Amino acid sequence: ASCRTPKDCADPCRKETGCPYGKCMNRKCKCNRC
């Protein structure tokens, strides 16, 4: 998934991992765990 600012990964990262830790690295959601 792609983003605009890294808070746009808070919705796909809260759906796929479950916590909203993800960076906007060249329009890609680099998601993490809590």
The CATH architecture term is 2-Layer Sandwich
Instruction: Give the termini separation.
Output: 19 Å
Major sheet: arrangement of strands: 1-2
Task: State the name of the first-level CATH class.
Answer: Alpha Beta
Order of helices and strands: HEE
What about the largest sheet? 2 strands, antiparallel
Looking at the structure, the CATH topology is Defensin A-like
Number of helices: 1
Number of strands: 2
Shape: globular
Compute the gyration radius: what is it? 8 Å
Q: Name the helicity range.
A: 10-25%
User: Which structural class do you get from the secondary structure elements?
Assistant: alpha+beta
Strand composition percent? 15-25%
Total number of domains:
1
PDB class: toxin
Keywords: scorpion toxin, alpha beta, molecular modeling, potassium channel, toxin
Assembly: monomeric
Entry title: Solution structure of the potassium channel scorpion toxin HSTX1
Description:
This protein has 34 residues and is an alpha+beta fold. The chain is built from one helix and two strands. A two-stranded antiparallel ribbon has the order 1-2. It is 21% helix and 18% strand. It has one domain (1-34): Defensin A-like (2-Layer Sandwich), CATH 3.30.30. It is globular. Strand 1 and strand 2 form a beta hairpin. Keywords: Amidation, Calcium-activated potassium channel impairing toxin, Disulfide bond, Ion channel impairing toxin, Neurotoxin, Pharmaceutical, Potassium channel impairing toxin, Secreted, Toxin, Voltage-gated potassium channel impairing toxin. It is found in: Secreted. This is Potassium channel toxin alpha-KTx 6.3.
